[PDB]
Ligand binder design. Structure first.
Ligand SMILES: [Mg+2]
Lengths: 363, 365
């Protein structure tokens, strides 16, 4: 912390939020800032650090990042209401329930003429270590060691290889961009304002299995980002492999180091960005929906079905994923995607024939 | 600091300097890092913050940024040898002498046929305040207040106007851009890795006089960057206005706040990047030297006269920005007079080459 800050009136340190569009700017009042300015977490993370992402970027919707598990409680005055609004009324008294039971996922296979690929991604942080905005090189390397040792322990169709981002041959970097496996190196304003780019590429890397359907990015925005993906529409298969991977990686880490994933009854899994709390899950498809793209109801229809659509901007190809993360389970979110993409595909198919979809539109 | 870091052995924290090209990588050994990793300055700046700029950017030459004046002492084991190498042998036991006496600047006007423009630039920080990698919003605002008040007080030829960067309208932004008056927003990795981009545009501004020949940037890399510049070769006039402006601003800050510029007997003016210590002066002319440009000795002649040259254009060929090489260990008077004397010689050599005569006897040996 800058030790002379505490000597100035808090009003002199209060961010100027004129022109800001963030939940940070909405909830961090003058009086709240003066209350918490000089309160640090047990690892040394400060209020200013926590909000720097929003203060530097008035166009961001959220504006906050956690530096450690305790950020969420030490600064609960700020984090609680931002989480409540972002997550559609999820109160400090509400609690989050996990459900990783792959037997409960809808077994429909999404039509592969429309669904290019199906994916389930999540994040996990290791309890006992600071999060990316705050983590130091020794912490980050320890995380790298434990996570990569757990991944290198996977066998059969989960057998793979770890690729450190520091150790990278030229026939290597090219190949991984080739599969598109490489995470963007951290130049966006979101990563640099949030302290998350420090030391790059030290401590970061990418693990994938040989069959290229299970992939883990290490020490990016969360200590791990775990992704199961495959061609076509068999979402239940993707989820089953996701859960087995997750289970075995967790087991290895606990058996070898005693460490566990950050998690609590209130927030479920703790992630760096409050937008990702709860399940941390982005369950998506890449779907070819060019008639839906020409339809002015497309965003509204997605929203009503609890889906987000994200395009490249081409082709009418959209990433379609779950909007909801906190206060519903993984099983619910994945099934929401399956149910809703099924409807989009049926609509796309009617529109190709110049037929009505008006009766398929959700209430 | 991250309180968890002290839980781990220093070896686990030591940067991996493979492929680095910086003086940081050359001097920060494993044992020195172990010694200093958990030592902070009184304001709380840490070793890892000071080195972050270079750890993130293997090609940067220095790789270090100071967060406060104490950075240089608390981490002297690292800063001293980096300073000694970059500044051509300036030792921890050497002390810098300041001389800002404008009456000592040579009055030669460099030939206007050859000298297009003349500029003197320096930076100053405010003693006892954190530097840009570390400063908080309240300090940075108080700096803007005391500096902008001082500049607004200036009169006569120095009368001018302050432009805050917050909420600057597009009309003004365009005018200042056209004048080459506005500084870059801090998107460069030098600024992001060094913690100098925080809160932008909060606390930042630019001031210039109505005559547009004196310009100040507030809260960019140093708390102030101060520039005096005009067309032609009257460097003595440029320096006189520079020093008069600096004297008046410093006197106003001293009277209104009791603060003054950050400076000590060893390093002279204390700036954020160790490259700018001592005088922090870059005294330059643009000079039309197309024949010297084709002489293979041009560079060694410059170094020998303690000048640096850099090609420039924007279209007439053969133009060079010729500036002082030294910052630490010689005075502002010495560095500005080195430019004036050096450019005089270059123009004589250039005039000889124009007639295909030899310069063999004029090259210092
Ligand atoms: Mg801090």
């Amino acid at each position: 912390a800058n030790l002379n800050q505490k000597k100035y009136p808090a009003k002199d340190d209060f961010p100027n939020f004129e022109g800001h569009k963030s939940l940070l700017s909405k909830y961090l009042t003058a009086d709240m800032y003066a209350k918490l300015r000089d309160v640090a977490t047990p690892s040394g993370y400060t209020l200013d650090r926590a909000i720097q992402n929003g203060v530097d970027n008035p166009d961001f919707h959220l504006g906050l990042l956690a530096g450690d598990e305790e950020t969420y409680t030490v600064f609960a005055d700020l984090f609680d209401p931002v989480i409540e609004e972002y997550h559609n009324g999820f109160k400090k008294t509400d609690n989050h329930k996990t459900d990783l039971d792959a037997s409960k996922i809808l077994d429909d296979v999404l039509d592969p003429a429309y669904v290019i690929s199906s994916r389930v991604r999540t994040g996990r942080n290791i309890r006992g270590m600071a999060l990316s905005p705050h983590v130091c090189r020794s912490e980050r390397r320890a995380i790298e060691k434990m996570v990569s040792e757990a991944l290198n322990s996977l066998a059969a169709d989960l057998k793979g290889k770890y690729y450190s981002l520091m150790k990278m041959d030229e026939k290597t970097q090219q190949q991984l961009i080739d599969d598109h496996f490489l995470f963007d190196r951290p130049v966006s304003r979101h990563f640099t304002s949030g302290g998350m780019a420090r030391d790059f590429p030290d401590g970061r890397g990418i693990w994938h299995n040989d069959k290229k359907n299970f992939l883990v990015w290490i020490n990016e925005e969360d200590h791990t980002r775990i992704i199961s993906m495959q061609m076509g529409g068999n979402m239940k298969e993707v989820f089953e492999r996701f859960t087995r991977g997750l289970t075995e990686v967790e087991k290895h880490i606990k058996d070898k180091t005693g460490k566990e994933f950050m998690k609590n009854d209130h927030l479920g899994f703790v992630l760096t960005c409050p937008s990702n709390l709860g399940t941390g899950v982005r369950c998506s498809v890449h779907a070819k929906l060019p008639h839906m793209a020409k339809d002015k109801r497309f965003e509204e229809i997605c929203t009503k079905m609890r889906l987000q659509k994200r395009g490249t901007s081409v082709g009418g190809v959209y990433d379609i994923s779950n909007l909801d993360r906190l206060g519903s389970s993984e099983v619910e979110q994945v099934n929401c995607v399956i149910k809703g993409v099924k409807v989009l595909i049926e609509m796309e198919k009617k529109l190709e024939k110049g037929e009505s979809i008006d009766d398929l539109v959700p209430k």
